[PDB]
C-alpha cells in the first residue's frame, strides 16, 4: 500500500489549500532534531523535547519554514519536571535563523534563555520568549525586530522563575518597533510603564508586576489600543493562593484621573487585584467604546453602593466586581447603586464574593430595565436567604448563578484567585433559562419555593442537602423545565411518582444520591421512569445501587441511561433471576453505561435482557474475567462495545459470528495475550478496534484479513508485548506499509525482544536476515 514507510517520529500533515507542510514532533523524547524532515516543511513544532542546542545545521534545508515552535526544551527549574530536570539552557549558535527567509513565527518559550536571540530574519511577525531569563530589554537588541507585530516577553521574572532584580527596560526601547501590535510584559517584576510605546499597539499586557503608580502621560500616544491589562499591580493578597506582596501603606495602584484620555479605541480594561478603593468617574469621560471591565479583587464594596463612574459606560457589555468584600464583615444585604441602571448595553454582571446574608427583590432593582442582561453571577456570597420568586422579573436572562451560597428555607474552578488565568502551558445552558443553585444548603423543597418561575428550562440543585422523599408535588410550578440536575443530594425514591410533575423534563441527573441506596432493606422505586413521557437522558451514577423493590424500569422515551458506579453484581447475583430484565422495557434505550459495577462475570440472561435498540454498551472497569462473546448475538443493533479496563484474556473465535453489527470494539487495558486464528474474518462492519495495553506477542495475517483492516478508521495496538522474531515478519511488514491509522507508532509500538530488539520500535525494524 505504501512503497516507502515513514520512519520520522513526527506527525506529518498536508494542507495544500494552505500550502502548509506541518511536521509536529511534540513530546517525542527527542535529544536531536530528527533527520529526514520534509524539505517543503512550513510549520515545524519541537515542543517538549530535550534538544540541547540549535545550529545552522538545524534548519539548513528547511527553506520554506514560516513557523518554528521550539518551546519547553529546557523549562525553568520550578515549572518543569523534577524527575527529568533540564541539565542546561538551550544553546543557540549564530545565524541559526538568518537563513529562514520566510519565517513569520518563532516560539522559543521556556528554554532558560538569557538574551533575545539575534540574527532573526526581517519576515518575523511574532516572537515569543516567555519563561526564559531575559529581564533587561535594550533597544539595541530589538533593532532586528523592525517588522515584529506580536512580542511575548512575560514570565521572565516572577516567583516560579525568579530573576532576583527589577525588570529593566531602556527608554524608548520599543518605540521604533513601528508595526508592533501586541506587547506582553506580564509576570516580570516590572516597576514602571515603559515609555514611549509605539502608537500602533492594540493590546498591552502589564499585569502581575511591581508598578506602584501610573503616570498621566504613560499611555497618551496609544490611540489605537483596544486592550489594557494592569491587574495585579498592588495586589489584594488576603487568601492569595500564590506568594503575594502588597504595596506599602495599603496603597492602591495610583492612576491619575486623566491617564486614559488618549485610549479612545479601548474596548477592554482589566484592573483586577489593584487594591482600589475608588473608581473615579473621570477615568472614563473619553472612553465611550469600553465593552469589558474587570474590577475584581479590589476594595470596592463601598464603591458598589455609589459607583457614579457607571454613568460613563453605556456601551459596556460585561462588568466584574467579584471579591471586593470588606475583611471580617458579614454585611446584611447587597447595596447596589442606582447607577447600575445606566448600564444599558450590559450582558454579563458578576459580583461574586461581596459576602452578604440576605438577598431581597428590591436590592436587584437597578437591573430591572437592563434589557440586554443575560448573566447575573452572585456566587460565593454566603447568602443564607433568597426568595427564588424574585427572579419573576428576569425571564430575559440566560443564567442566574447563585452557586456556592448558604441558601436554605463556565468559568474555571480556580478563576478569581489564580495568579495568571492566562498562563500558557507547554452543561445545561443550551436548554434555555438556567437557575444555578448548586452547592447551597437546601435541605427541603416545597412546590411554592418555585412560584412565578414557570419559565425555567434548567434548574441546578446539585450538591445541596436534599434528604427528601419526592412524591411528585415538589416541582409543580416548573412547567417548562427540560433539565434537572439533582446530583449530590440524598434523594429517597420511596414513591415512583417522583419528578412526574416535571412534564417537559428531557434530562434528569440523580447521580451521587447514594445515601438511601446504601441502607439495608429500604424501599427503592426504580420504576419511577414510566411517568416521564419525554425523558431522554437519565443519569444515576455512583449511587451504590444494589437492591430494588421494582424489577423493571420502564420508559418509552429514554435513549441514554448512565448506571455507572452501582452494584449490578449484587442485583444480578448468580441464582437470582429477578433483575435480569431491569432495562428490557426501556424500549428506545440506545446508550447504556454500566461500567464500574463490579461485574466480574455476566450471568446468562443479561444479554437477552437488554432492550432491543441498544447501540452503545459500556462494560468498562468491571474486573470482567470472562465473556461469552456469542451472547452478543442478542444485541442486534449493537455498534459500540466498550470492554476497556477489564481482565479478559481472549477475543472471540470469530467476531463476525458474534455480532454482524459491531462497529467499534474497545478492548484496551485487558490481559489478552494472543488473538484467535480467524478473529476478524468477515467482520466487514468493523471500523474501530482498540487492542492497546494488552499482552499480545504476535498477530498473524489470518487474524487480520486486510479486507477488514482496509475499512478500519483507527487500529490501536500500542503498549503490547510484541516479539520481533522472524515469525513476526508479516505483522512488521504490514505495520510499516499500511494505510490504516495506528497512533503512537513513533513512541510506544515496540518490540519486547528478543534481547537485541528490546525497546526497539516496530516501524524501524529491519528483518532482512529472515530473507537471506
Amino acid at each position: 500500500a505504501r512503497w516507502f514507510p515513514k520512519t520520522l517520529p513526527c506527525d506529518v500533515t498536508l494542507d495544500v489549500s494552505k500550502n502548509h507542510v506541518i511536521v509536529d514532533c511534540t513530546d517525542k523524547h527527542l535529544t536531536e532534531i530528527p533527520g529526514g524532515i520534509p524539505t517543503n516543511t512550513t510549520n515545524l513544532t519541537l515542543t517538549i523535547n530535550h534538544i540541547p542546542d540549535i545550529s545552522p545545521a538545524s534548519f539548513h534545508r528547511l527553506v520554506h519554514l514560516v513557523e518554528i515552535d521550539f518551546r519547553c526544551n529546557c523549562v525553568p527549574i520550578r515549572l518543569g519536571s523534577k524527575s527529568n530536570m533540564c541539565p542546561r539552557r538551550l544553546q543557540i549558535k549564530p545565524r541559526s535563523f538568518s537563513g529562514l527567509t520566510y519565517l513569520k513565527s518563532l516560539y522559543l518559550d521556556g528554554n532558560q534563555l538569557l538574551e533575545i536571540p539575534q540574527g532573526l530574519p526581517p519576515s518575523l511577525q511574532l516572537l515569543s520568549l516567555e519563561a526564559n531569563n531575559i529581564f533587561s530589554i535594550r533597544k539595541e537588541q530589538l533593532t532586528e525586530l523592525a517588522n515584529i507585530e506580536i512580542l511575548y516577553l512575560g514570565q521572565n521574572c516572577y516567583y516560579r522563575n525568579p530573576c532576583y532584580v527589577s525588570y529593566s527596560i531602556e527608554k524608548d526601547a520599543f518605540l521604533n518597533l513601528t508595526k508592533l501590535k501586541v506587547l506582553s510584559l506580564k509576570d516580570n517584576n516590572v516597576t514602571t510603564v515603559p515609555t514611549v510605546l509605539p502608537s500602533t499597539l492594540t493590546e498591552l499586557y502589564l499585569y502581575n508586576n511591581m508598578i506602584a503608580e501610573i503616570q498621566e502621560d504613560d499611555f497618551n500616544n496609544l490611540n489605537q489600543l483596544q486592550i489594557l491589562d494592569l491587574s495585579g499591580n498592588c495586589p489584594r493578597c488576603y487568601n492569595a493562593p500564590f506568594p503575594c506582596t502588597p504595596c506599602k501603606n495599603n496603597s492602591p495602584l495610583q492612576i491619575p484621573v486623566n491617564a486614559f484620555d488618549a485610549l479612545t479605541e479601548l474596548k477592554v480594561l482589566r484592573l483586577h487585584s489593584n487594591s482600589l478603593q475608588h473608581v473615579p468617574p473621570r477615568w472614563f469621560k473619553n472612553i465611550n467604546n469600553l465593552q469589558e471591565l474587570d474590577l475584581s479583587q479590589n476594595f470596592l464594596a463601598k464603591e458598589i453602593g455609589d459607583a457614579k463612574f457607571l454613568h460613563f459606560l453605556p456601551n459596556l457589555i460585561q462588568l466584574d466586581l467579584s471579591f471586593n468584600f470588606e475583611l471580617q464583615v458579614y454585611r446584611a444585604s447587597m447595596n447596589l447603586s442606582q447607577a447600575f441602571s445606566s448600564l444599558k448595553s450590559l450582558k454579563i454582571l458578576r459580583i461574586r464574593g461581596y459576602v452578604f446574608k440576605e438577598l431581597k427583590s428590591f436590592q436587584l432593582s437597578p437591573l430591572h430595565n437592563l434589557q440586554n442582561l443575560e448573566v447575573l453571577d452572585l456566587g460565593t456570597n454566603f447568602i443564607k436567604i433568597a426568595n427564588l420568586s424574585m427572579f419573576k422579573q428576569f425571564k430575559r436572562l440566560k443564567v442566574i448563578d447563585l452557586s456556592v451560597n448558604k441558601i436554605s428555607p463556565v468559568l474555571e474552578q480556580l478563576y478569581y484567585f489564580r495568579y495568571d488565568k492566562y498562563a500558557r502551558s507547554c452543561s445545561c445552558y443550551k436548554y434555555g433559562q438556567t437557575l444555578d443553585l448548586s452547592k447551597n444548603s437546601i435541605f427541603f423543597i416545597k412546590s411554592s419555593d418555585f412560584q412565578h418561575l414557570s419559565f425555567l428550562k434548567c434548574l441546578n440543585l446539585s450538591g445541596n442537602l436534599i434528604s427528601q422523599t419526592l412524591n411528585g408535588s415538589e416541582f409543580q410550578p416548573l412547567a417548562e423545565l427540560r433539565y434537572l440536575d439533582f446530583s449530590n443530594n440524598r434523594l429517597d425514591l420511596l414513591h415512583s411518582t417522583a419528578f412526574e410533575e416535571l412534564r417537559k423534563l428531557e434530562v434528569l441527573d440523580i447521580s451521587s444520591n447514594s445515601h438511601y441506596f446504601q441502607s439495608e432493606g429500604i424501599t427503592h422505586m426504580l420504576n419511577f421512569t414510566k411517568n416521564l413521557k419525554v425523558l431522554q437522558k437519565l443519569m444515576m451514577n455512583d449511587n451504590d445501587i444494589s437492591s430494588s423493590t421494582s424489577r423493571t424500569m420502564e420508559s418509552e422515551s429514554l435513549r441514554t441511561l448512565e448506571f455507572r458506579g452501582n452494584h449490578l453484581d449484587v442485583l444480578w447475583r448468580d441464582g437470582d433471576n429477578r433483575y435480569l430484565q431491569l432495562f428490557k422495557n426501556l424500549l428506545k434505550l440506545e446508550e447504556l453505561d454500566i461500567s464500574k459495577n463490579s461485574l466480574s462475570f455476566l450471568p446468562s440472561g443479561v444479554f437477552d435482557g437488554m432492550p432491543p435498540n441498544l447501540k452503545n454498551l459500556s462494560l468498562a472497569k468491571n474486573g470482567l474475567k470472562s465473556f461469552i462473546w456469542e451472547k452478543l448475538r442478542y444485541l442486534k443493533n449493537l455498534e459500540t462495545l466498550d470492554l476497556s479496563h477489564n481482565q479478559l484474556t481472549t477475543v472471540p473465535e470469530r467476531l463476525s459470528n458474534c455480532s454482524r453489527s459491531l462497529k467499534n470494539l474497545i478492548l484496551k487495558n485487558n490481559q489478552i495475550r494472543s488473538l484467535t486464528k480467524y478473529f476478524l474474518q468477515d467482520a466487514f462492519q468493523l471500523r474501530y478496534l482498540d487492542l492497546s495495553s494488552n499482552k499480545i506477542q504476535m498477530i498473524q495475517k489470518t487474524s487480520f484479513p486486510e479486507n477488514v483492516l482496509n475499512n478500519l478508521k483507527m487500529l490501536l495496538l500500542h503498549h503490547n508485548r510484541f516479539l520481533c522474531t522472524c515469525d513476526a515478519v508479516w505483522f512488521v511488514w504490514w505495520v510499516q506499509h499500511t494505510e490504516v491509522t495506528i497512533p503512537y507508532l513513533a513512541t510506544d509500538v515496540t518490540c519486547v525482544g528478543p534481547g537485541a530488539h528490546k525497546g526497539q520500535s516496530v516501524i524501524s525494524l529491519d528483518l532482512y536476515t529472515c530473507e537471506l
Copy 2:
C-alpha cells in the same frame, strides 16, 4: 543455614505443645495433592484448589491425620468462579479415609458430591458437607457416623445451589447418632422437622427452609438443646435481597404453644423472618434460661405494644425486634409495651425498622430501670424528631445507636436482610458512652442540642448535613467528650476557635468535609489545633485541601495526623515557600499520613519542615517519580517509611548513609529494576523491607550483606521480574537456603526467563549446569 530447602508449596507450622504439624495448602492452584507432605502431619488443608479426585494414595503415609480440610475443590456453579469453572465433581475412591484411625474432623463442603461419603473411620467427630448436592438422607448412609458429634449438611438445595425437589429425610435417620450435638440442615428445602432426633443435641439449625408447621412433639426429647434456629420458614419477603417465597395466604410459621416445653436448657431461640403476628406467652412457660431471642423480620409491630411474653423472660440478655414495621404505614411514635420493664437481665435491645416519626422521652420509660441495659439500637427508623437530652436517663448505657435516621432540628452493613448471615466462605465504643447519630439529617447544631449530655465520651455525627462555621459554642455541654466523629459534613473552618469547647477531646475526625475546601479563595483556618490541649489524633482525610489562610498548624499534644487525599502538591507548588512548615510546630507528632496528595515530587524544604519527633511517614500513592534519599537525614526519628504505590525507579546507593533510624522501609508497587551495589550495607537498624511488585531482575550478594538480612523480621520480594540465568546463582542459592521470612516463595517468587524457566518458582530451581 538450611541444609534441605523447603520446596513444598504449602505453609507448614509446628505447635509442639499440641503436636499439631499443620500443613496449609489453601489456594495454591494445585491439581494434585503435592508430594512430600510430612508423615507426622496432623492438620492438612487443601481448600480452594482444583484436585479432581481423592484415592487411598491421597493420604497413604499420613498415619497421624486428625483433620482433613478439603473444601471447595469443585464449588457449585453459582457460588464458584465463573472464569475457572469446575469441570466435574470431586471423585472419592473407596477406602480413601478408612485408614486414618485418628481422624476427628473432615470438611468436604463445596465439591458437588452426590452422596454421603462412605468408608469413614469411627474416630470422626466432625463431618461438614455444606454446598454439595446431597438432598436425601437415609439411615443406612449414617450408620458409619456412630461417634459423630457435629454434622453440617446445609446449602445442598437452595437458590444458589438448587436441587429442584424437596429435601428428604428418612424417619429417625439421626436417632442412632447417640453423640450428635450439632446438626445443621439450613438452606436445604426441608419441609418438616426431621424426627426423631437424638436427645443429645445441643444445637439444631433448621433455618431458611420450607417448614410451614412445627408439630407439638417435634422437639419433645431435646432436653439438652441450647440453640434452636427456625428462621426463614414462612419468610417475610418484602424488599428481600434474595429470591423469597412466602407461605400461602400470608400464613406464619405455625408453632404450637407447647412446642418448646422440653427445651428447659434452651439459651438461643431464633425466629427471624417467620412472618409472626403474635408471640404467645405460653411458648416460654418452661424455658426459664433463655438468653438470646431474635424476632426480627416478622409482623410484630402491634405485638411490640403488648408483648406479654416478656414477663416470662427475666434472664433474657439480648432481644432483637428489628424490621417489624407495617407495610405502607408511617406511625407517629413508638409504642413499647410496659412489659419491657420485666426484662431485668437485658443488655442489648434492637428495634431497627419499626418506622416512626418522632421519638419522645416517655416512649422509653419502660426501659428506664433496666439496670443492665448496655446497647439501645433504634437505627433505620426514619425518625424525624428527637430531643437528645432524653438520654440523661441512660447514662449507664454504652452505645445509644440512632444511626441512619432523619433527625433534624458492630453489625455488618449486610445484616438483617442478608440471606444467610452465617454462610461460610471457602470505632469509638472503647472510649465510653457513645451516642451514634451518624447518617441523619442534622444541618445545624447549637449548644442546647446537647443539654444534660455531659456524660458522653464519644459522639458520632458522621454523615450529617452540617454546613456551619463552628466558633466553639456549639458543643459546650459535652465536657467529657473524648472522640468526635465529624466526618462527612460541610465544616467551615472560618474560625480557629472551632471545637475548642471540647476540652477533653482526644480524637477528632473531620475527614470528608471537602465542600468548603473546594471553594477558591474562601478562608480556611487550619491552626484550630492549638486550642485542643489533649488532642492526640486528628484525621482530615479526603478534604481536597489545596489552600490555607494559616501557614502553620500547632499543637503541644497531637501525635497522629492523617492528611490523606488532599492537595499538598498545590500547597507546596514549586516556588511557593509559605506552607513548607505547615506541620513543623506539631511538636509531639509521631505519625503523618500524606499519601494520596498528588506529590509527584517533594519540594526542597518539606523534610526540613517536618516536626522533630516524626516516626511513621506515609508518602504512598502519590505518583512520586523521584526521591532525594539523602533528605531522610533531617528525619532523625524516622522509623517507618511507606513509599508504596509510586513511580520510583532506584533505591539509595547506601541506605545506612540516608537514615540511621529507619526500621521499616516499604517500597512495594514501584518501578524499581535493580538495587544499588551496596544498598543495605551496614543498615543495622533495618528490620522490615518490602520490595514486592517491582521490576527487579537480579539481586547480588553485595546489596544484601548477610549481617543485615539476619536482623530482618521480614523481607518481601514477590512479584518481581527475576532472571534465572547463571548470573543469578547466588540469589537462587540464597533464597532456597535462607532462614529469613519471605512470603509467597511457593506462589509468587518466580523466574520471568530465560525461555526454559519461565513461570518456574525460584525455590524449585536447579542450577547445577552453572557448576559443571
